[model samples]
Target: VNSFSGYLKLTDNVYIKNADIVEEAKKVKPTVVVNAANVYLKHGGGVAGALNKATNNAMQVESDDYIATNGPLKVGGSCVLSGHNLAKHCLHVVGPNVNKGEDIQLLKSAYENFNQHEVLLAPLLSAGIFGADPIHSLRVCVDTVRTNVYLAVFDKNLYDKLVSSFL
Candidate 1:
């Protein structure tokens, strides 16, 4: 079922749940859904992949067009694209790779760059393929975002950790 397990409110409200970010975005219908994209903006894996597949490759094509037009996005930078199936728009933010230097500021910037929307559905930026810790990612997002957010976590353990740490 589509349900949240816990909730936290910073300057903005955030609901924590173990669910697919794409599906949650569809259900919640946020103004923009965040895609934890890489610098290249390729929707190949993780949340990006699911969103691409959900939109029947439209998301991937749009991302390619964006990169072709604007060049590769820098870490902590972002671009907005049409959310063909998930939300009104997809806010693609490039997060810092944990293996790299100067990660925290970059990750926080990723969260900070997309403040135009009132409702946001986002995942734990850099916490998946980029290898940042879930709690750390959540902390950065919570510190930066200024609008209501739906945090769609994929793992039960991570969900429990967020609930324990934030709730």
Candidate 2:
């Protein structure tokens, strides 16, 4: 089978809203999780913490296994990347836009470091950083990654379209 897989469009804007990421995660039952730039490490770290707590500290990535870094492309705020629970090999790539090339490189680095099955989950690219422009962010994500992607959006029309496309 191809190393790369398909993409899944989720139904809520988890990055800024702190919406229903955990609940959606329950539905996916993913072995690996990926987050977007807007995910707050301090305030809404609940979802990540919940995952770690539930999985016995296996959910967060370690420093060695995952590299968190960023480049120019700041819609707002600072662009930085960090990893936790590295021993578990779960990577978290957060920061600025970094264009398509850099973004792919970071993702590739994370995948290579883990050397295990990888599943990428992220919210709308610009939802939190840029705004609620799901279509634009979705297009950018689709263009950037070669592996499977799970995109979460909060728009009802988009959500319905996503469901219809899949079913």
Candidate 3:
């Protein structure tokens, strides 16, 4: 179980923590839970897999349905789908998989494309298998969000790095 460790306040409404984002979503019941989705919008692994499990696969079903209807998502583009159980909605943003090329602009645009929400819950996008630098991803999230954003991160090392840099 990923438990809350500590949080570094960025603003009155923004903060970051080493915690489980799914549980954090459950706690706040945010307007949307951002998913680091692929171009296909498949919820196969990583944070997408965790969210699929939490939503009892309903999220994936909707995602598949969405793709069938709208075609694949493009890099840095996003679309919102209905969320089940813990979340009111899910925002699927396809980040640039930097193994291709380290395009910070594309990764940053993923955050920029998010739908407006009162309370947004998100992970560190493109910083895992997608391969963008974690601190770069963190800064993009911090700089872009316009509402109350609680970034619930799973990596302890990244969390330590964040606290060291920001706190």
Q: Predictions ranked by lDDT, top down? A: 3, 1, 2
Q: TM-scores of all models?
A: 0.88, 0.43, 0.88
- Once fitted onto the true fold, the runs of candidate 3 whose alpha carbons sit more than 4 angstroms away are 1-6
TM-score of 1: 0.88
Which of candidates 1 and 2 is the stronger one according to TM-score? 1
Candidate 1 Cα misplacement greater than 4 A, ranges: 1-12, 99-102
Please identify which of the two predictions, 2 or 3, would achieve the higher TM-score against the true structure.
3
Model 2 lDDT on a 0 to 1 scale: 0.38
- Looking at model 2, which ten-residue stretch has the lowest summed lDDT? 10-19
Question: What total of clashing residue pairs does each candidate reach?
Answer: 0, 6, 0
Model 2 residue-pair collision total:
6
Per-residue alpha-carbon lDDT of model 3 for 69-154, expressed as tens digits? 89998898899888788678888888888877746688768887653667677888897778888888877777786776778878
Whole-model lDDT per candidate: 0.79, 0.38, 0.79
Give residue 1's lDDT in candidate 3 (0 to 100). 16
